Design a protein around this ligand. Structure first.
Ligand SMILES: C[n+]1cn([C@@H]2O[C@H](COP(=O)(O)OP(=O)(O)OP(=O)(O)OC[C@H]3O[C@@H](n4cnc5c(N)ncnc54)[C@H](O)[C@@H]3O)[C@@H](O)[C@H]2O)c2nc(N)[nH]c(=O)c21
Ligand SMILES: Nc1ncnc2c1ncn2[C@@H]1O[C@H](CSCC[C@H](N)C(=O)O)[C@@H](O)[C@H]1O
Length: 261
């Protein structure tokens, strides 16, 4: 019924070539060539990002969508792209990252970009059952794609449900992935959360066309329904007007070393 639900249905109707063409339509992504080469060679002191996540968080941070301050907690940290980005910011005093890191799930990567020493990575952790901890900045980048809109909705509502427990502890800043903001129940939950904690949902330009993911962030306040539909319209336009045109941008390079007393 929602424009996003229509988008999801049409996305699944594309043949293999149509899908490939759509995925490459008017997108922007960082060039990962150097980072991948450095990581494959075991280089840990060149400042490259462990994942594309570093550039995604940088985009939100550099324009005030989320302030990264004090005690940072990263739920579903994976390799740690958000943890390393946060650790390099002067306003951040410490970073605690949690992730599954088992049964195919990405494990934290150990590199020595600026502030690596103030990060505490913990794997074998299901954040849905992790007792909330007090922090100043709450980050969460969880949401597994599914060809089923119903499944994406269920997964998204579960993430928001868990995150609400953490926000209820009192946090100043947050950036939380919302996998399927186009689903009716998710929109309503977001409206309720906004009335309780403020913020709004924003589409990151680095996100792929094949996902409707948006992020619930603390740095702005706007009508959720409007912004989500704005994104649905953009994604539908790209599907109807394929181009396969990709734009590349420089990946993030962080300073290196420890942050000490
Ligand atoms: C591989 N794949 C994924 N999707 C759709 O794209 C979403 C994201 O899949 P991804 O690949 O980008 O993995 P993240 C899936 O949840 C599904 O709806 C596809 N749709 C078509 N029509 N053909 C595909 O081959 C296809
Ligand atoms: N219930 C759960 N508990 C902990 N981690 C989970 C989880 N469900 C998914 N994850 C992890 O959440 C991660 C999402 S991808 C996160 C990428 C990260 N922001 C970066 O910048 O590198 C994946 O590693 C996935 O394994």
């Amino acid at each position: 019924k929602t424009l996003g639900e229509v988008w999801k249905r049409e996305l699944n109707l594309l043949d293999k070539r149509q899908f490939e063409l759509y995925k490459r339509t008017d997108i922007v992504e960082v060039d990962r060539d150097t980072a991948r080469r450095h990581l494959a060679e075991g280089k840990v002191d060149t400042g490259v990002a462990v994942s594309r996540g570093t550039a995604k968080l940088r985009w939100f941070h550099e324009r005030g969508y989320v302030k990264l301050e004090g005690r940072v907690i990263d739920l579903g940290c994976g390799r740690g792209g958000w943890c390393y980005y946060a650790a390099a910011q002067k306003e951040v005093s410490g970073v605690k990252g949690f992730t599954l890191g088992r049964d195919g799930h990405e494990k934290p990567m150990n590199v020595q970009s600026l502030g690596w020493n103030i990060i505490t990575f913990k794997d074998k952790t299901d954040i849905h059952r992790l007792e909330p901890v007090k922090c100043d900045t709450l980050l969460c980048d969880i949401g597994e794609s599914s060809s089923s809109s119903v499944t994406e909705g269920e997964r998204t509502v579960r993430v928001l449900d868990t995150v609400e427990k953490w926000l209820a502890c009192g946090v100043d800043n947050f950036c939380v992935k919302v996998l399927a903001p186009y689903m009716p129940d998710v929109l309503e939950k977001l409206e309720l959360l906004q009335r309780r904690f403020g913020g709004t949902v924003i589409r990151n330009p680095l996100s792929r066309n094949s996902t409707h993911e948006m992020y619930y962030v603390s740095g702005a306040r706007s009508n959720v329904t409007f912004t989500v539909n704005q994104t649905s319209r953009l994604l539908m336009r790209r599907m109807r007007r394929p181009t396969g045109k990709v734009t590349l941008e420089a990946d993030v390079i962080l300073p290196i070393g420890t942050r000490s007393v």
